Structure formats: C-alpha cells, structure tokens
Amino acid sequence: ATILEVKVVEGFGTTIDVILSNGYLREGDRIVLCGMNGPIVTNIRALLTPQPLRELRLKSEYQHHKEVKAALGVKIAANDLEKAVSGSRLLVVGPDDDEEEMMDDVMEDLTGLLDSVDTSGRGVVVQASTLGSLEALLDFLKDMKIPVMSVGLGPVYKRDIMKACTMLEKAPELAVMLCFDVKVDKEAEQYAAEQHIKIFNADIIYHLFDAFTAYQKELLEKRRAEFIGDATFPCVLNTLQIINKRGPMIIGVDVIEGSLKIGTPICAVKYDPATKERITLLLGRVTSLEINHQSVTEVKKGQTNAGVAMRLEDPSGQQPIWGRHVDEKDTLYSHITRRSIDTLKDPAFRDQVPKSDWMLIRKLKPVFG
Amino acid sequence: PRAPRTYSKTYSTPKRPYESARLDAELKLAGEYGLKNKREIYRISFQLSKIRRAARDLLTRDEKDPKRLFEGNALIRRLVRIGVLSEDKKKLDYVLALKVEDFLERRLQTQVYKLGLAKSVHHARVLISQRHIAVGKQIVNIPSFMVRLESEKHIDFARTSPFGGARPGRVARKRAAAAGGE
Amino acid sequence: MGKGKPRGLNSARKLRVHRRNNRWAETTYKKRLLGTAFKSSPFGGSSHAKGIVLEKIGIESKQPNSAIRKCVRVQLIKNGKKVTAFVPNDGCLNFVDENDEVLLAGFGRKGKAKGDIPGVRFKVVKVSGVSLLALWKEKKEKP
Amino acid sequence: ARAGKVKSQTPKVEKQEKPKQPKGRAYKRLLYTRRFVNVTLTNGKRKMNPSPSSQ
RNA sequence: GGAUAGUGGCCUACCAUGGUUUCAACGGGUAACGGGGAAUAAGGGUUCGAUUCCGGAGAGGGAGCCUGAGAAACGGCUACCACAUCCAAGGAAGGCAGCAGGCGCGCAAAUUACCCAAUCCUAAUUCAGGGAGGUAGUGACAAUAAAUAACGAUACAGGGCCCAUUCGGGUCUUGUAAUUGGAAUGAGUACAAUGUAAAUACCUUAACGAGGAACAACUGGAGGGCAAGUCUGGUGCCAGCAGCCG
C-alpha cells in the first residue's frame, strides 16, 4: 500500500501508479487514500498491467486484470481523485471500520511540501504531466528566483490560460506558461497571443528555464534603458561665447563635469547673493547640439576640446534676456533641486548611474537648495 | 419509457400570508383537534373545494335532465356514506354549505376520543401512531383515516399489543426479571 | 360613440394587426422579441456566472447617507467582460481574497442600481466552493 | 478598522443552558393554551411579546 | 418522345407567353423540429412544448453506390475536405447524437455494477441470443403518508364559588417544577422465514432498545408594507442594514 505518481492519462483521467509490498486487490472493493484538501473514499474503476516492459515511458496500451497479487507495481484507474498526492498509504476497507488516522499522518507530509506556490503572488503558471516532476520544477524555479503563483496538471486548454491573466494589468511581462512535457489544443494556442501571454512549451526542463530567461532579459532592458529621457543627469557648463541671443537661443558652451542629454533641464544661476534665489528658469531643455556640423548624445566627460553649440527651446515662462539677466561670465548648471531624485533609485539599473557616480549628488545640494 | 407515473399535488396554500384574523381561526381548529401542521387544515380546504366546484357545475344545469341527476346523486350518496352530510339533507344545495368542521369531526383521531379509550384528545393520536386500534381485523395507524359510518361499530383495541392479551410489558419486563429475584 | 376601433363582424384582420403594432410599446414584450438580454446585460441572459478577481475597490454611496460600500472588480470567464460586484456583511472581503474564482448573482431589481450604490448591479455569493454565509458564520473554513 | 470593525470589537456574550423546547404538536398546544384558554391580562389591546414596565 | 415500380416539366426537342402580388407575394430573423400536451385559472385569455406516445430529419461535413422484397444503410462500402491512430518507415486501420466511463465547455446533469425471471423481440427457432428491457447503486427533480413525547398523584399557584358573621372547606377545573412514577414505541441493531434469476429493501417477528445529560429541528424574521421587543450591553455619518419608503 503506497502511491508513487499521479499521472493524467486519456480515458481514465487522473490515475495513480502504486507499489504493493504485500496484499490482494480486486476490481470493485473501495479504498481510502489521501487528497491535498480532502479525505477520499472511492471505488476501483479498472486495473492495468504493462505486459511486460516499462511502466509508462512514452507509449500507452495495457492489459486488463480483474484481480492481482503482490508484489508488483500497477496503475489504478479510479474516480473522485482529481487531487491525490504521491506517497499516500492506499488502505482498504472490506467489511469494517472508518479508518483514516493515516490521513493526519500523511497530510503532515503534504502541508510541508507545496509551500512555494504563492497563492496570491505575481505570476506565473506551471503545468506538468506528473506530480513528481511538478514538485521538482517548483523547487528548481525557487532557487533561480522566478516567482511562481498557480499550479495544475495535464494538457493546457483555454480556461487554464486565463488562469494566470490577472497580471496582464500589473507587470505586464510576468504572465507566461511554463509547460512541462504536455501538449496544447488550439483553442488554447488560438487564445494565447492573441492577448497576450505567451506559451513556452519544453520537454526538457532547463530549456523551460533558458527560453524564459532569454525572453525576460529583452523587455527588462527595454525598460531600463530607456530612461533616457525623463531622468535628468546633472552637468556643469562654461559659457565661452554667444551665437544667437534669443529666438532661438544658441550658446557656445564647454562641458566640464557630468553628462548631457537631448532633454536636460538647464538653469544658469544669478548668484543670489543674499536671498538664495535666481530664479529657477533658463528656457528648456536642449533639442539640438552641434560639434561643428554633428548632433550627438552626448559630451562626457571632455570628449571634444572645441566648444559645443547649444539649442534651447521655449516652454515655460519669460526667457532671460542675454546681457541684462544673464551674461557670458555666468556658469550654467542643471535644474536638479529635489524631485529628480524620485527618478534616482529605479532598482536593478543601476547602472546607469554607474559606480564612478555620483558623488556629484553629494554636491547637489547646494548648489541651489 | 413505459408509462409516466401520474401524481397530483393535493394540498394547496392561502393567497395572503399574514392575515391576523385567519391565523386565530386556524389556531383554534388545531387546538381542538390537535393537528401538527397548517397542512392538515389545508388538507380539508382543497379536498372540500373540489366538491363545491362539482356542485356548481351540476346546479347551473337544468333539473330532470341526465348528468345533473346521475352525477349529483352519486356525490350525495358518497357524503352520507362517509358520514359528513346528514341523512335529512340530500338536496345538492346543502352540500355547498358543508364547512370544514364536519370533515375534521369525522376522522380516526376524534372518534376514538368520543367513544372513550384515550381521554384528553392528544393521547388518542399517540395510541393510533403506536400500533393500537384495529377497526376491522387489521391495525390502522394513520390519523387521517376518515371512518366510513357503517364501520364505526367495530372500533376496539387489538387482539395483540397492550390492552389485549399477548404482549405483557417492555417496562414491566424490567419488573418481571427484577422482582422475581426478591 | 363607436369607441374608435372597428366593431365589424368581418373586422378580424384590422383588430389583430392593430395590436401587433401597439404591442411594441411595452418593455417586457420589446426586450423578449428583440433580445437585448443575449446581446447585452453582461451575463449571457442567465441566473449566475463565475469570474476571477482583478482588484478590490471602495465605492462611495449617494446623497442623504454617507458611507463606503466595499466592492470587487471581476473578469468573467465565458464572456471576457469586466464588472463591479458587491460583498455583503461586516468585513467579509477579507475571506474573498485577490486572484480567486468568485461566483456572482443579481441584486433583485431586473438590472438597475440597488439602494444607494452608483452603477453596481451584481452581488458576490461564493468563493472557491464555499459561500460567504458559511465563512462569516465560522462553520467550515476556505480550502 | 476599515473592514468589519464591529464584528471583532463587540463584547462577546455566549449561549445558556435553557430547558429545551418541545417540537411538533406540543408547541402548537403551548400557543393554544398561552393565548386562547388561559387568558392573558390586557388593559386595552393585546400584546404578544411583553416588555419590562420601565422607561 | 425519353426515363420511372407508376403518374408529373422529373428530363429534352419544337412551340405559346404566361404564373404569384397590400385577402402581404418575394426577401430577412428565429436563442424554430410539427402535434397529442404542460403552466397559470371568474369569464375571456397570456406563456411554454429539447423530453416517457404518433410522424419526420441525421449519424464528423458533402456527394456516390453494392447486395436484398425493403437502404442513397453508416455498430456496410468508394472518393474528396476536416480531425486522428499504429509503424521494423515498405505501408496497415478509422466514425459513442447505442451502454456505462473520460476529456472539454460551463451557473448546469448518475455506476466502466447484477441478469435475461418478467415486458416483449429475431432466426432453420419450446431449448440460443438481446447494455432493447428489467434489478440494485448514486439521487432534498418533483409528489404521497407523518416520530421529536401522553396520561398520573404530589409540589407550586391561579380560575369557578355552597356561603362571600373574617376565615376556609377547595366539594368541581386548570396551567406551572432538573419534583417523580409506572405504562408504551420504532428510529435502531438482529436468529430465522418470506422476498428475489440471485441479493438488497419493505411487510411479520424471535433476542436486545428513552429518561431530559439525552434518541437533542432547522430556516428566516421582530420601525411601515406585514404577524411579532419601546429589551439590556457594544457601535458612534464609521463599520453595516435596507426589494421600496429609509
């Protein structure tokens, strides 16, 4: 009396492979095994045999026995065991008793078993042929640090794909199928993408890690980068000359420190000098640049000795008129005061900002305040 | 696929639920005759309603013509046989004003008490349910039997059972074995 | 006074055809014949339907009173459309959980809003083979 | 709390060892004897579920 | 004329220009198989009829035939279009909208049991066979019948009152007590014998079987509609109730 595996076979449904030390079995007498969430009692549907090679391996055709004798392994077809965990003691009840008790013995081996499945986690979904491989796959993905949410067995249908589609709004790249050695209908593959899973079927088991991981690294590196733009990387600029004063403003700057970007907020500080004001505006941002004839992205630390020409747009407020408000001798800086550091962090990327930097965000602030 | 076995939902229900004047009327009916449910009052209501509808069909038709006379007579012959309708009121029109009290005072419940035997009404139902009272040569054990008027002459205790002959004790079987030792 | 309508012995045709036109000015007849229950009414013209929970939203009640009502956003299985259901009793949404199958039902108004809730036309009943009556009255727990 | 505060917050009072009610015909005889036969004390109109005489 | 078992534009050849139509043709939709019927019930009527009887279609989707009196048969065949098996890679074999059973779809539906004893049914046939059909299992789909205590004397106290010199006899009847007392009983379990194809189950009964702790009734209500709390403690525009008024 021992269960070995929980295979999903055609015709019978959820079968159970047993290994029998000593005893008798006949096609009719009920058993009392163990479910993950239910003490089961049920009849024998049928009883198979290999005749006389393999247990399962690949192909599927069996003999039919009315009664069998120990000691040998055998598949038992039966009813009301859609969940029925491996390693249970398959007891029998002929004329007497409501047995159980072994329920509590072997349900302690089930409670501390499949704890990796985060019941309300964040993806993905696993589907296996047998329950033995399903336990090993969860423990494999446990150490590689991929979160695992829901679990099932057998072939995948369209109802089992929406199973893991609560994460279409959140991630959205954390809602995929990791199918272990089982087929799909279509139907199912004609619902997958579509909208917008998608399936990764493999029959080894570190493919269906490598295929997932290679896919995952594409769209996490299309998030960071790109930011690029929005994230303002600070800078310092020596104003050498003035090309065109206004409409639009073109300034022959020279980069001392830090990186520049198409979309770096600029602020040339009138050095207070008492009130710590300036006040925070030099219109733009910078749409275009020019190293002689070439627009670039961008100059850091000091790539070119020749002076680079700026090109500032006109978004918010009055532009400081050149000569009156600001002049050639003022050093131009970035806009960074406080809320650029909201964009700082964005964990996992890292880098940028690289480990030589920054270092200048100890300097900032102040600077301004 | 032989013959769908035909059944009939006999006993029905009132139209309004919480009509307080009706509730008091139905309670005193249960208080007198010791009925368990409201269903046993509705038992008469439906079965009595069928007899009224049959009378309304036969009355509106012309007299001294076939069905009216033949069907209406068989209806009256039945109601005087069972003992609900009296012998001096075989006119069809009297069947319309029968009322529920005549049916409820023509059962194996009430007739056992009025003979004697049980005493205190509720005791009679307990005697009927516990395999006493053989009307013919066979033990009846339904309260809603409806006695046939002619058959009321034979209502006695059974030959077997307590108050009969054979069966002695149950509770006295304790006192038979125990008192024999002393 | 001839009462408008034709009172002829051979009027038959006009009496029948006049009423098949006037029958269209009744909501229950119009919706049965045209069949907006199949083509609309989020469900498939049915009593109950299951779905999966997406998020848990707190909805504000209307004017004279003032309170937050507690609701759940659900994706239906058979249709694929999304709705906003209601969770009854004190607490109760603690047992409902996120990312779980939930069986929905009507409110008892033939569509329409119920009481004081703006645009909430469904009610939560069961959560994975156990009703909220059973869980709220601690008699058997969730699986 | 923002999710069933009064369900947990209330003082917990428990059931008592009452003498059991009789079922069936015996319960209907109680209601017969209580209202009709024994005659309850009434000044003006009747009262099914009484109250303590206090404000 | 041809074909047909046989009538007919059913099909051809040469002619004639007719046929149906606001008394609704022609087209569209049907979450449409037609009836015998079912539900509701003053009289009239509304709504439903997949489904135990009768008739008609279809066997994954379309065409096509062979044998027989009778078949465009599908638990028979020949293709093409889907879907599917077994391969030693040469080729083989396919059709559950029969009976169980598994998938899937869903709010939504039973055992891979025992048997031809009945009902009938087929052959060359008293004899063989029949998942037609019957017998159990599962089954709060509906419907019928109706256990959970009954009678006592005391113990608590009310009602009638011969009379009410004050009482109280209490002659008559009632409801209240973990007082108590003898009497019943199948719900159970169980030799037998009936029952049955053989068994279960019912019906009859040997033996054992009730004392409030058990052999313990739930389900929804108590502001109005609508029968029923101006009851204690908690809660304080929150948590919640409420078909509607709130």
How far is Cα A222 from Cα A204, in angstroms, rounded to an integer?
29
- b/e per residue A310-326 (b: at least 16 CB within 10 A): bbbeeeeeebbebeeeb
Which residues of C carry a binding-site annotation for Mg(2+)? 64
Residues contacting residue A328 through CB under 8 Å, at least 6 positions apart: A239, A240, A241, A242
Q: From its phi and psi, is residue A348 left (phi > 0), alpha (psi between -120 and 50) or beta?
A: left
Distance from CA of D52 to the nearest CA of C (A): 32
CB contact (8 A) between residue C94 and residue D6: no
Report the 10 Å Cβ neighbour count for C142: 14
CB contact (8 A) between residue A119 and residue C99: yes
- b/e per residue B68-102 (b: at least 16 CB within 10 A): beeebeebbeebeeebbbeeeeeebeebeebeeeb
> For residue A302, which amino acid is it?
G
For chain D, helix, strand, coil in percent to 5 are 35, 0, 65
Looking at chain B, how many residues does it have? 182
The parent domain of residue D42 ranges over 1-53
3-state secondary structure of A274: coil
How many domains, chain D?
1
3-state secondary structure of A121: coil
Residues contacting residue A314 through CB under 8 Å, at least 6 positions apart: A247, A248, A283, A284
Q: Residues A55, A60, A61, CA angle at the centre, nearest 5°? A: 95
How far is Cα A52 from Cα C73, in angstroms, rounded to an integer?
55
How far is Cα B30 from Cα D32, in angstroms, rounded to an integer?
8
Residues contacting residue A66 through CB under 8 Å, at least 6 positions apart: A26, A27, A47
Q: Residues A226, A229, A235, CA angle at the centre, nearest 5°? A: 125
Which pairing describes strands A235-244 and A308-309: parallel, antiparallel, or unpaired?
Answer: unpaired
Experimental method: cryo-EM
Q: Is the C-alpha dihedral spanning C110, C115, C119, C120 positive or negative?
A: negative
Q: Is B43 on the interface with D (CB under 8 A)?
A: no
Report the 10 Å Cβ neighbour count for C51: 26
How far is Cα A234 from Cα A344, in angstroms, rounded to an integer?
12
B12: closest CA among B33, B41, B34?
B41
Q: Is A171 on the interface with C (CB under 8 A)?
A: no
Beta pairing partners, A25: A68
Q: Is D32 on the interface with B (CB under 8 A)?
A: yes
Report the 10 Å Cβ neighbour count for C105: 16
How far is Cα A253 from Cα A264, in angstroms, rounded to an integer?
14
Q: What is the resolution of this structure in A?
A: 3.6
Cβ atoms A324, A258 nearer than 8 A: no
Please tell me whether the peptide bond between A100 and the residue prior to it is cis, using omega within 30 degrees of 0.
no
D33: phi then psi, degrees, rounded to nearest 5: -70, -30
A298: closest CA among A335, A260, A341?
A260
Note every long-range contact of C33-38, with CB atoms under 8 Å and residues 24 or more positions apart, other chains counting.
none
Residues contacting residue B180 through CB under 8 Å, at least 6 positions apart: none
> For residue A146, which amino acid is it?
I
Report the 10 Å Cβ neighbour count for A335: 18
Considering only CA atoms, give the Rg of chain B: 22
Beta pairing partners, A79: none
Cβ atoms A207, A214 nearer than 8 A: no
Nucleotide nearest to C39 (CA to C1'): E31
How many domains, chain C?
1
Distance from CA of B53 to the nearest CA of D (A): 32
Residue with tokens 């965000």: A361
The parent domain of residue C39 ranges over 2-143
